[PDB]
């Protein structure tokens, strides 16, 4: 039972996620979509700067590179 990165990622679609970016901002939303390069599309997106709710962005594509880690949320 090793969990590997792509399968783990595929496993997160549909559900709440917190994506956190190489530059410190993070984005909570429902992971709608995903691709080969680990680009992602989020819906009902919420931006956090310093950890302070900054904006309500709705639908959002995130470029793969900028991502630091992604994780699930309840």
């Amino acid at each position: 039972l090793p969990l590997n990165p792509k399968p783990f990622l595929n496993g997160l679609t549909g559900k709440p996620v917190m994506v956190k970016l190489k530059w410190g901002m993070e984005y909570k939303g429902y992971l709608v979509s995903v691709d080969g390069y680990m680009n992602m599309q989020l819906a009902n997106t919420e931006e956090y700067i310093d950890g302070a709710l900054s904006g309500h962005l709705g639908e959002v594509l995130i470029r793969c590179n900028n991502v630091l880690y992604i994780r699930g949320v309840e």
Binding site: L21, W23, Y27, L57, G58, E59, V60, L61, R63
Partner: peptide, 13 residues
């Protein structure tokens, strides 16, 4: 250049 991109909003307001 894509490099310069962070996020992209669909239907912005």
């Amino acid at each position: 250049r894509g490099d310069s991109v962070i996020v992209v909003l669909r239907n912005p307001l």
